[PDB]
Structure 1
Amino acid sequence: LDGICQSTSNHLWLLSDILGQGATANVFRGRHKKTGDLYAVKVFNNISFLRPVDVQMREFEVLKKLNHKNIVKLFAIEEETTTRHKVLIMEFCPCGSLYTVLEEPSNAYGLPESEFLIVLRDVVGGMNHLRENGIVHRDIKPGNIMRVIGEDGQSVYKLTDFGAGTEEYLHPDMYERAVLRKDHQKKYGATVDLWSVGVTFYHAATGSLPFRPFEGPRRNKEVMYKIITGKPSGAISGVQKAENGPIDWSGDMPLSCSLSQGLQALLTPVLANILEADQEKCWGFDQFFAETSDVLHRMVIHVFSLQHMTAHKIYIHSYNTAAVFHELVYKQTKIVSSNQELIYEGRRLVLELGRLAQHFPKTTEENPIFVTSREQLNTVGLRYEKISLPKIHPRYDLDGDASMAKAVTGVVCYACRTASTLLLYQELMRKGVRWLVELVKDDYNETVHKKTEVVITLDFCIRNIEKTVKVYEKLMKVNLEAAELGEISDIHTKLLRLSSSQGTIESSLQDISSRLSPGGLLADTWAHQEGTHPRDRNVEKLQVLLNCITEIYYQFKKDKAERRLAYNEEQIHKFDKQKLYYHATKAMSHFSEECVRKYEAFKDKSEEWMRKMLHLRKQLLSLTNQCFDIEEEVSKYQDYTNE
């Protein structure tokens, strides 16, 4: 009620300090009386006293020995002081659960990918420890996945809330409860465990539940069953999308899902074979644990395609060769291995086919391995979902206002992440186009170094046989020096065919030097005009508005909790409702007019510039190979200049 204490001989807690209200028990924040440390206390209701206590504490001992991260620690079983009944002393996770985590508006459309992999890593490692200690757990939900801050800062998710007549005189209606007790037991077949796990993973990935009838999954109790027991093999989500219209299946993550394409490629097949009605084609734990832990042991290399203007996470094993790296890059970019040029920190990147992934250059999302083709490729862009504000109910409703506020915060929150990615795409494009231009400079500079090596061996052979005409026709027979000879006069005209046709190699190579020059025809002048920039501060401008909308939303929650407001406080709440819509719209249209429009203008100026640069690299290649054709042409003619 208020200022009420329960205690054991070793802990105490306030009934008001309640963390968790379940049907069988309640959990409280408590302290160890002598040290002051914080523990959670699980105290059981009056209806949890319906199975013997000899086998109830049999369950609890076998749990008190479970020692493992990803499992909340059970420290002791003690007895309350005044009343005498059993309480569990557990590990206190002050950060709450994955449920409170998904309840934030930042995770309104799914967790960020780095955190998802942790939920995945930790939930799978928890189940495995439970399966190994002979414990089934089918109630795995965000509600009872706890979150702890590990001492390195990254989250650690931990599992919890798991356990360890005479027939011939019966009325035929009551005889049906004497045959559906052993026969209606459509026995579970051990693959039931990971249906929850699969729903949880979809929830954490997308911010929404996988199977949803319109009006909610709970208001429409019946259409729910039609969806679960009718989902095609491989389908991942079923949504009504209509007041009462047909249901819409899909085996893909929603567009709103921001996880990398690489990861969805790994993740969808897992969920597809984890959500399955029969035991035969549905996965077993041996296969689930083996297939998932394969995703966990992969490292991530960030590559960015300049031709496409698209980022890519490459999920690859530490022991995989450079060959599989190229394949994985092809699977996302449609650029074949023999067409992949890698650029890293300004210089090209050669992969020796024996090189292992662990020895690759370290990458971050903002320091990626760029990949470009010499062939033509159309720019794709960042594929995101176009989300706009919900309609604002003019009713003064404290429940409805808090819900509308959560939604608006989550939409502006999404626009704010997207706008951030749009700036990275533009900033990475600029970082890459800059280097690509400098690599065509190395390619041009190499061609000139070879040309000025062949132009001087061509010359030392021409004046080497022309100076024998200075002795054959000037000092001896003195006649017209024009009549042709047999053997050498055919290789003399063949050399003049090289020296003169190479003169027009310079006139075209000089043109490509000029268009590749700084103020030239291929300058990256669009890159410094056509986008948004870090100095525009569009992200933090949005953030500033999102902070106001968020501050209102948190308040509208406290208003809902207070259930009904005083007079001045009601007018402020009403005033702040208009303020919230003002800020949201100010943000959403700024997302449209400043972030998106200037990004699209930049995306299109890069498709123009991309065609231009590909053409030039094709010309410079055509000229480079002529220098090797003139290289071998003088190779067979030079040793003939022996005398």
Structure 2
Amino acid sequence: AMQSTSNHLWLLSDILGQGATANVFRGRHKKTGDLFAIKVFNNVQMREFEVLKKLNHKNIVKLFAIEEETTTRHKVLIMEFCPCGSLYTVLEEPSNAYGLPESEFLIVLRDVVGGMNHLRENGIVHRDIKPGNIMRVIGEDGQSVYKLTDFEEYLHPDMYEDLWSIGVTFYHAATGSLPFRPFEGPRRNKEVMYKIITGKPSGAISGVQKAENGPIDWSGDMPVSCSLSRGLQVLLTPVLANILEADQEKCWGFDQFFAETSDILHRMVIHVFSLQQMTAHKIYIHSYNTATIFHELVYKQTKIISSNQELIYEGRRLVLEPGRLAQHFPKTTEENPIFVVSREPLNTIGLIYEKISLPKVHPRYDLDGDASMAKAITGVVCYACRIASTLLLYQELMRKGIRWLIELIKDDYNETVHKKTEVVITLDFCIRNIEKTVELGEISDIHTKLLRLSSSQGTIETSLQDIDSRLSPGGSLADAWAHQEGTHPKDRNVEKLQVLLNCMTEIYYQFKKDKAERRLAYNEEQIHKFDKQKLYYHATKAMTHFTDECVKKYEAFLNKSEEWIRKMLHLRKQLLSLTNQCFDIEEEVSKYQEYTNELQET
């Protein structure tokens, strides 16, 4: 049994979204077989619907045609089918439980901004913009494409009794959670939800009531679990904070919103890894800005002075001209960035993350309880699987940066030998050319000064070959410990966690299907119970392997890194002083090579 039309037909089982106005079915065309989104209304239109046909944009679901059903003669809308679901469906997956991927987040912001701007150029107010009103289509290039279509938690404080729901959506897509949540959720604590919005804190964007009828934990920054880069949070926070307060006097409006959002999307990314702080970063800088502004953003994200920023890329030093535009910088990835080191001693911090534990599993056979329990616990393992791959990246980036920096130091040492041979040759060809010619005080004073030079020049040679003995294998500065301390891709730790993650996701997706069915049979009930216990042994087995292998080896590698940083900073100061002791005596032998060697006489 199913409904049909002159051109389309759809089954009642293939139902997608179910709402108050109408329901949307997955239907096909009678002549082509192509799939469409059929909207059948449960219950002026012929003009306001044909004006939505001509609406053609990448970020808007195309309304193809309007046909009338066969049996009920209901107005049926034929719309573009988006097989991936809505943004809410995307945010339901455990990998996005603590926030969208950073690249995926930019696609959402681009399509959402690009879609509403085309609707404002035509004059359509969306009123309600939630992850449910944002569909997802896979483009011809494999990247997601988000589209608006349909035009309690996403309401303005005055409407609770336009840019608001956009700020709630972007915060939801960035943290994996809502900005304003009471204790028992926005249900019976609905009056608390309104008291949270009317608190008008302005600068703050979050309000978490972690106790029943307790306080409201405000914050102006993103949570630690945010999977966006710290450079992206700095540019995102003021956009939300200025669109999340009831004051129209203090509201931004679309023009300042569209301007500041277009500013973010037009910035390219320069990947930088602070080798001394063991921190990776992303610099959002416009392609027309100069490298001076680039060093400014690095200082605002690492507190390293701009003049002290020494850059390494692909095994060599990197000199940035202060006027060199950002679009001419070398292309960088998260795995091949620009290592920044500084002569000033820096604190070794490492990666900062929110340390979460497994929530306990209840024995109550609750199809809704087990589902909401399985969703949070699988998102925790994803976060632990996320941090595990980040710690592995930090360690492998550390090994390349250290294995490079020792070659850059050995390059500064080899340049010092070049200036040493230039002084030794000058010394010998000037201390012996005097012996050839050899009124006595004018010559004996030279040898009491030429022999002081060759003596202090020799002490440089001894303290140089000492550094050459330190930059040798096993010379109290070898990078061999980096390969024998932390975790490696050979251990395959990220994949070992990904194995237990898929089993927990398959159990979650099954419990998500078990909740749709109102009740289960006796046989299916015991499978829902047996796999609910396996969900605990997988999460417990993963958290054991995560903390007792990934974290321990990481903190052992980091602790060994902080010591090696000091021993490296120590050797750099010596080699710098030893080279400065070569330049000032390269010119001290210049005061005597032309002095007495060239007397005056006709």
Query: Which of the five TM-score ranges fits, normalised by the shorter chain?
Result: over 0.9
Q: In the alignment, what sits opposite 2:195? A: 226
Aligned partners of 2:472, 2:156: CA distance in 1, in Å? 97
Q: 1:129 to 1:504 in 2, by over 3 A?
A: same
Does the residue aligned with 2:482 lie in a helix, a strand or coil? coil
Q: 1:75 to 1:169 in 2, by over 3 A?
A: closer
Identity %: 94
Task: Tell whether 2:133 aligns with 1:170.
Answer: no
- Range that drifts further, 225-234 or 622-631: 225-234
- Range that drifts further, 620-629 or 271-280: 271-280
- Range that drifts further, 516-525 or 286-295: 516-525
CA contact (8 A) 2:157 2:246 kept: no
Cα RMSD, aligned residues only: 4.0
For residue 568 of structure 1, report the CA deviation from its aligned partner: 2.6
For residue 553 of structure 1, report the CA deviation from its aligned partner: 1.5
CA contact (8 A) 2:277 2:346 kept: yes
Q: Choose which of 441, 452, 466 in structure 1 pairs with 2:435.
A: 466
CA contact (8 A) 2:156 2:164 kept: no
Flag structure 2 segments of 5+ consecutive residues without an equivalent: 598-602
Task: Tell whether 2:505 aligns with 1:550.
Answer: yes
Deviations 1:368-397 (A, max 9, x none): 110001110011111111111111111122
For residue 561 of structure 1, report the CA deviation from its aligned partner: 2.2
CA contact (8 A) 2:156 2:246 kept: no
Larger Rg: 1
Aligned partners of 1:393, 1:436: CA distance in 2, in Å? 52
Does the residue aligned with 2:312 lie in a helix, a strand or coil? strand
Does the residue aligned with 2:27 lie in a helix, a strand or coil? strand
Aligned partners of 1:566, 1:414: CA distance in 2, in Å? 34
Deviations 1:124-181 (A, max 9, x none): 000111111111112110001000001100100011101xxxx9999999999xxxxx
CA contact (8 A) 1:321 1:354 kept: yes
Flag structure 1 segments of 5+ consecutive residues without an equivalent: 47-54, 177-192, 469-482
Aligned partners of 1:173, 1:371: CA distance in 2, in Å? 49
Aligned partners of 1:24, 1:133: CA distance in 2, in Å? 24
Deviations 1:562-616 (A, max 9, x none): 2222223222322222211011101011110000111011011000000000000
CA contact (8 A) 2:277 2:349 kept: yes
Q: In the alignment, what sits opposite 1:127? A: 116
Taking structure 1 as the reference length, the TM-score comes to 0.90
CA contact (8 A) 1:464 1:641 kept: no
Deviations 1:192-241 (A, max 9, x none): x1100000000000110000111001231100111111131111111111
Q: 1:422 to 1:173 in 2, by over 3 A?
A: closer
Task: Tell whether 2:102 aligns with 1:113.
Answer: yes
Task: Tell whether 2:271 aligns with 1:302.
Answer: yes
- Range that drifts further, 138-147 or 16-25: 16-25
For residue 305 of structure 1, report the CA deviation from its aligned partner: 0.4
CA contact (8 A) 2:99 2:175 kept: yes
CA contact (8 A) 1:376 1:614 kept: yes
Q: 1:625 to 1:175 in 2, by over 3 A?
A: closer
Aligned partners of 2:423, 2:232: CA distance in 1, in Å? 51
CA contact (8 A) 2:485 2:556 kept: yes
Q: 1:408 to 1:61 in 2, by over 3 A?
A: same
How many correspondences in the alignment?
A: 596
- 4+ residue runs over 4 A deviation: 167-176
CA contact (8 A) 1:236 1:250 kept: yes
Q: Choose which of 519, 534, 544 in structure 2 pairs with 1:589.
A: 544
For residue 533 of structure 1, report the CA deviation from its aligned partner: 0.6
Q: 1:633 to 1:285 in 2, by over 3 A?
A: same
CA contact (8 A) 2:136 2:146 kept: yes
Aligned partners of 1:7, 1:587: CA distance in 2, in Å? 50
CA contact (8 A) 2:312 2:339 kept: yes
Q: 1:559 to 1:446 in 2, by over 3 A?
A: same
Q: 1:101 to 1:171 in 2, by over 3 A?
A: closer
Q: In the alignment, what sits opposite 2:14? A: 17
Aligned partners of 1:128, 1:331: CA distance in 2, in Å? 32
Deviations 1:323-345 (A, max 9, x none): 11111111111111110111001
Aligned partners of 2:465, 2:292: CA distance in 1, in Å? 38
Aligned partners of 2:417, 2:220: CA distance in 1, in Å? 54
CA contact (8 A) 2:128 2:155 kept: no
Q: 1:494 to 1:12 in 2, by over 3 A?
A: same
Q: Choose which of 404, 411, 414 in structure 2 pairs with 1:445.
A: 414
Q: How does 1:334-353 map to 2 (within 5 A)?
A: 334-353=303-322
CA contact (8 A) 1:231 1:238 kept: no
Does the residue aligned with 1:487 lie in a helix, a strand or coil? helix
CA contact (8 A) 2:172 2:178 kept: yes
CA contact (8 A) 1:461 1:641 kept: no
CA contact (8 A) 2:155 2:165 kept: no
Q: 1:447 to 1:41 in 2, by over 3 A?
A: same
Aligned partners of 2:538, 2:98: CA distance in 1, in Å? 21
Q: In the alignment, what sits opposite 1:34? A: 31
Q: How does 1:151-550 map to 2 (within 5 A)?
A: 151-162=140-151, 193-468=162-437, 485-550=440-505
Q: 1:173 to 1:501 in 2, by over 3 A?
A: closer
For residue 436 of structure 1, report the CA deviation from its aligned partner: 0.4
Aligned partners of 1:92, 1:273: CA distance in 2, in Å? 35
Aligned partners of 1:171, 1:458: CA distance in 2, in Å? 82
Deviations 1:245-300 (A, max 9, x none): 11111001011112100000110011111112111111010000000111001000
Aligned partners of 1:348, 1:218: CA distance in 2, in Å? 58
CA contact (8 A) 2:289 2:326 kept: yes
Deviations 1:404-447 (A, max 9, x none): 11111111111011101010000100110000011000000000
Does the residue aligned with 1:106 lie in a helix, a strand or coil? helix
Does the residue aligned with 2:95 lie in a helix, a strand or coil? coil
Q: 1:170 to 1:630 in 2, by over 3 A?
A: closer
